[PDB]
Amino acid sequence: MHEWALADAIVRTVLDYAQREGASRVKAVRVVLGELQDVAEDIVKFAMEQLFAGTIAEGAEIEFVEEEAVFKCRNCNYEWKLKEVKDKFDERIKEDIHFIPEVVHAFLACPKCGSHDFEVVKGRGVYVAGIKIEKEGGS
Template sequence: MHELSVAQSVLETVLDVARKRGAERVLSVRLRIGEFTLLNPEQLRFCLEVLAEGTPVEGAKFEIEIERGYFKCAECGHRWRPEDESLKDPSLHTAFDLSELTELLDLKCPKCGSRAVKLDGGDACSIESVRLEVPGEQHAQG
């Protein structure tokens, strides 16, 4: 379960932002996770909530937005969405390197048949915003 390690990294970053801004507590954290990261949003939220206990992040609202991903052919430039069902294949969850995903799915470009297929978006996890309670300020954005 890589949700735990991602949650730890997110929490460390959020705590660092809160500390630098002099925040008493964190009100909300908005994350964007790519569907190709194979992160489970519910598990990630659970890990964040558990790890946040006893910190200024405890009680914060975690908003998680899913970024859709595409495949792109390196030969002809065609861009397409995968079948959503193909992303539910349990064997994909063994991919530790996202570049392995195109190999595991045995992808071919639907336009030209090339196997030179790359991920185009949906492969990252980012903190989009952090809402803080800073003494003397009205709900600062971080």
């Protein structure tokens, strides 16, 4: 799922909610993207804006948030995050580190037990966390 299919799905999730809610405008959208995603975030925004043009979501502020990766070894059921550092990389300022998804696999091996054949619990998908809208009418 490249940036275009991603933006298309996100925009569809936003406009659908706005439709059933009877919204008159979409003010903001918060999107969470896993750190394992290889998509270029500015392209996803660029595509979202192009799909929002002429809709009630035109002008909506878009906020992207990173979701840390979390794995669960299906051999010892242990759960760890990349920053875990059971063995902390030479650089102790762990928050300081940024992994590259295309070559992250080498660092993936369960710390407490053996290694590999894990399950990705978080940090892989993309999802809309919140949508801010405006509505009119009532009494």
